[PDB]
Design a protein around this ligand. Sequence first.
Ligand SMILES: [Ca+2]
Ligand SMILES: [Ca+2]
Lengths: 115, 1083, 184, 115
Amino acid sequence: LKSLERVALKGKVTDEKGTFDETFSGKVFLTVFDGRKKMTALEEEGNDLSLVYYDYPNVMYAGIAEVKDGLFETSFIVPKDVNYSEHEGRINLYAYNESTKAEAMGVDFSIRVQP
Amino acid sequence: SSARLQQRAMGKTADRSLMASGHWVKIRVDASGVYRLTDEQLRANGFSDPSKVGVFGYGGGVLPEDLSRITTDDLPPVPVLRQGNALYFYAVGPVTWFYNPAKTTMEHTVNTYSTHGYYFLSDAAGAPLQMSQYTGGGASAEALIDYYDELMLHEQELYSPKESGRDLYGESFSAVNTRTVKFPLRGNTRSSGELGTVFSYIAKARSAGGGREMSLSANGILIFSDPFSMTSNEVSNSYLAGKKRRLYRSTPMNSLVNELRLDANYSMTGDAVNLDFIEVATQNDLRYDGAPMHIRRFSNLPVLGGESCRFVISEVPESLVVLQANSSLTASLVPVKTVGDKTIEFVAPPKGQDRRTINTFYAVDLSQASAPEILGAVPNQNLHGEEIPDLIIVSTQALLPEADRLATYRREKNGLKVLVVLQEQVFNEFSGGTPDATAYRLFAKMFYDRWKANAPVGETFPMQMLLFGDGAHDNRKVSVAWQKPYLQQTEFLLTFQAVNSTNVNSYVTDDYFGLLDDQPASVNIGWRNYNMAVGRFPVRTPAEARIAVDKTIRYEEDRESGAWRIRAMPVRAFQDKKKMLETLQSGIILLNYAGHGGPAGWSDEHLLTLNDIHNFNYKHMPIWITAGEEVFLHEKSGTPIMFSTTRVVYNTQNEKINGFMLRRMFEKAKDGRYRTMGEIIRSAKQGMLSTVFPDSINQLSFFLMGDPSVRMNLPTHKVQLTAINGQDPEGQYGTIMLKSLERVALKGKVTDEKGTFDETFSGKVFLTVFDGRKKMTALEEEGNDLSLVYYDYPNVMYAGIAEVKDGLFETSFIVPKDVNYSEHEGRINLYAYNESTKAEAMGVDFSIRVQPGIPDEVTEDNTPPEIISCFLNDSTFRSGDEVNPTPLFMAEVFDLNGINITGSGVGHDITLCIDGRADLTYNLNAYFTSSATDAGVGTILFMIPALAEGDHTARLTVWDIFNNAVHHDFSFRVVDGIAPDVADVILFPNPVRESATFRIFHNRPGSDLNVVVEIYDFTGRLVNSLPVKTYSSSYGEPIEIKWDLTSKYGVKIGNGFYLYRCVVNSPGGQTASMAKKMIVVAQ
Amino acid sequence: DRWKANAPVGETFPMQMLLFGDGAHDNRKVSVAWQKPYLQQTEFLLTFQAVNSTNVNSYVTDDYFGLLDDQPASVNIGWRNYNMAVGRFPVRTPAEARIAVDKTIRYEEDRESGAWRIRACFAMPVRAFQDKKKMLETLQSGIILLNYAGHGGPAGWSDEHLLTLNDIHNFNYKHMPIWITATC
Amino acid sequence: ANGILIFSDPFSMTSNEVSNSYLAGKKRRLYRSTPMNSLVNELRLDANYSMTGDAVNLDFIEVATQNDLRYDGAPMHIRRFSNLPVLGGESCRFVISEVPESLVVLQANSSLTAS
Ligand SMILES: [Ca+2]
Ligand SMILES: [Ca+2]
């Protein structure tokens, strides 16, 4: 994914066994990070180095999308932001079937932001 | 050198306490005043000669946190005056008062640690410290005064918000909008005069703005009306937890005579508003009104600081004295003069020349003085005379044996000088028996000061302190929440609460107890040097304590848990040959952040102690070992330690700090061992002051919950196999193919933690070889539920020891004809011990995989069994030696395809035929025990029956499964009562899963002798000694002992290679058996 | 009994019981070890002790409370039908209790903790040796491991100090309890 | 009892029984009727264990005396089982003397069945 690129997402909802659930219809919530959280030590010429979490893998996008008969599709524009991050990004997904009150969830690490 | 003499001679602390001898009786008070002890009372409390008894201690009122201000040491003698049959002294209660020159009034202070002032009575003295005359009484008075300031204090310590401060709060205005407080006004109170009042309360609004007002009124006259308000954001905040307000004011009042009715009114219902206290100061005449009077004078002073006043008290009974008593240790008798009927006069300064002290003149009728609370006799003690220990364990009474158990463990295993004391004892010698957080600090300081004197430049203080016990925020347990019948008034260790400037915020900390330097008072508790590491076990009951100690002991002893970290979620740290070496020693400690689980009021009523807050249950990932500039770090072995804080900390632009990293955490000290967690944390803590980057809010206070003497269970040295049957095993998994009855040759080395070859490591290596890996196996059936085991018998192929010379070793073993259906990787456990450095090395290898023994069992085995050894009673036995009528025949035997235990089938049985006689033909098949550790090896152990004194001959014959036989002829001379008493033992089963049974065979049946089964570990340390006595009834039968695998410290032993043997404690000496290999696998 | 009347054939009793409180072995708290005001003034829930033939051995159990069938007396407490599931929070004080409830609430609500078990698609993972449709049954399988509360004291200590269920079975949900069997 | 020996029970254990941790004591219950004389104000029972240092504890002593059917200024739970001259369910004439006639006799095997 490149800065200011429109990225198109497509996905499905399955059961615990991974079989496609066409009965799952409602909304899907999904947040997209440009990287992974990682502990960072603020170094200096002192042996002790108090450390944080770069708990700001930047949020590239966050939005909702309708899920009809097991499927959904949305898109978002990649912001002009931090891509020095090595390795994968992260997409968190949470779907809710309004009629059955059932919850679905997923995590994806296929994306990588580029300069 | 000559300066050494000047250091000792100018020694602050005593080399021996006064409490070391003489009779000691603890007493206490709940109110400052004069207390009396009659000779009869003293005789009745063990004082044989009451003339020699004196008073000792400080009383209530806290010790200064500015150590330089503490001038006294050990047990300070209290000045006492004697009448006839009794002695009197001025005691000091928990409430004490000080002068505030800004508000030109006096203010009170409650002892946070104690509800009483403790003192001591003792003959040790030889005689009491006689009270002296007051000297400060000036010659000329610059003013004749007609009244003094009588102080009173309404204060209910009901609620204890943990966050607010060191203070407790009283009465709420949440439901009741108006609360009335009545003060008794006493005789000498003047009808009319200025009514001084300090009104302290706290308030949090539940809605924004609004007409909220706290109003006081005395006997209907309004003193004040204070407006209160809060912002929507202040109401919305969780941490804001109330605005403290203190209103000072003198109100001219009339007709105040029997009772003073104060009426506090808060105009709004539903808020979180509480009264803290009300101080009332009345103007009273200098006249005895049948009650002692603490004469103080500060209001409308007509004189300057240090100038003398003429005081004249009327209606004095003649059995009354006036003491100038600002403290117990400075009480003096004011020399008065009689100036009329029941009228006396003295001259003195009401206020000191410092202009910040208001002298107290206590007038008291000694006929009315009564005894303090005699608590009782206390045993002698001498903490002052203790040698500098390595560790100080401060315990409560209940927890003492559990503390002493840990002490004994550290003394024995870690080889430490450890001092165990009861906090009571610390209070006796460092705060005159009164509970005070500073008493701990002073006790530590004693040793610190002593050490520093001779300590070399650069060296850090080696001592550590372990607070063995939980601590309550409300130290006095006076709040309402502390009176629940369900939780009950147990003994806790004190908590110290670092209060900041003007009671704004406050944090509870144990670091206070390790601030032992002589730094100046300008340095706040936060920026002082952490000299001594402090750790705490927040345990309430002995059950909780035993669990803590057992966890800590089992950590150090489970050597196999430490090899798991060497056998290697994993988060990568981005830091912002020689360079990679520093990162191998690095480590990350992550703080545990104890939350706010309750909706404001719940926490305050239910989270009362450090244990409740920092839940000391084993919480997620505390220590990480570090194994484009992204370093990979892994969390390893459940270390008993926990680092906990409640307050959160942020970095430049609110970035939350999750912990800290020490680039030289795992760097070994001069002793070649890693540093103790306590020291690691102490240097860490000390470093967070020291650096100019964490100088603002970046400094953070956390709890070391755990034994500070704990060392991370991580190997100092590793054992590495270099060749197995000629193949290089490094990096291989189930590659090196081994066959049944194949001689396998092993070769290996010993390295340091970095993996560099250690040629200095020389001693013995213990190693056990398994054909596979432990795996869970479910016993299946057509039922959905399937109860499951562990195939906790990946069969032991071999187990033995080997010498380690200049870093290397080599041994061999024969693969037994056993289970090879196992698929993939086998396992070799290695444990080396360097006898000279007492250092331990460990290793695990998975390069081996057993293969099918092609299985025709052809008649190749024509080689008969080999008699390895064949003795009577001892190992030092040559054929034809002397022996008593009841021998104990022992014989080690070997055949690659096994010995005959089948039974019958002609003379195939193992037999001992003495003097070629059928009369004593024994089926010793039942006395043979196949070696679980050495392939083909077997051992025979039996007790030969008695016979007359003469030369004898015997033949041992043993047959193998392939029908090849062997004979072994030997002779021996029986002599009536010549041999010593000796026994041997066999372990059933081996390896050991849950329990072990030891069957002992002896040489002297019937006779009453002392046998013991001793178990040792690869380091040679005794695990335990199971003792047994041979009873008369059991004539000629072996004895059995069952063992639950618990160590001498009462902890179940871990998996590993052990050595069992038995010793016979005879009168003239001790005879031991040969050590035998014991392997433990299911623990 | 009320449910069974109208319950359809095959359906199991749906009700459950939660004993919200710790239990003492000496229910009357009359033994010497119990003589101590905290231990005394605390209210506990009862403990049931399944005593066998002629007081030989005995085990403490809460399963007794779920034995609601009308089976005959010949069937011992060990062989009767566990009709109702029973669970216990061995908590003594409200502080203990709040911690238990907070832990249980936060478990259901932390949806992200449940996605960590589903995230394991990258491959203390122990392999169980037992005896498309066959692989489907193993995805639904699970292993529960029992926590074995030991004998930490030298005989007499345990009897004077381990007085309640909480003291014996240490409450703070400890060591690997539930394993999910996963297949690629 | 009052100096008259009721019994003397021999006790013993194997080296393996002593060595075991779970063994935790052998429960023993001794039943017995002893003809006694002069039992009138107090009955002194003297239990003696011949060996010091063992883990031996008394559980209880039940004592059953033969008493006359006569009011002795204290309520009496009249039960009769010893040397019964009748079979189960057969009736007997009970005669109590010295009764104050503010006295009743309830046949009370339980609270709910008191008559
Ligand atoms: Ca207060
Ligand atoms: Ca042979």
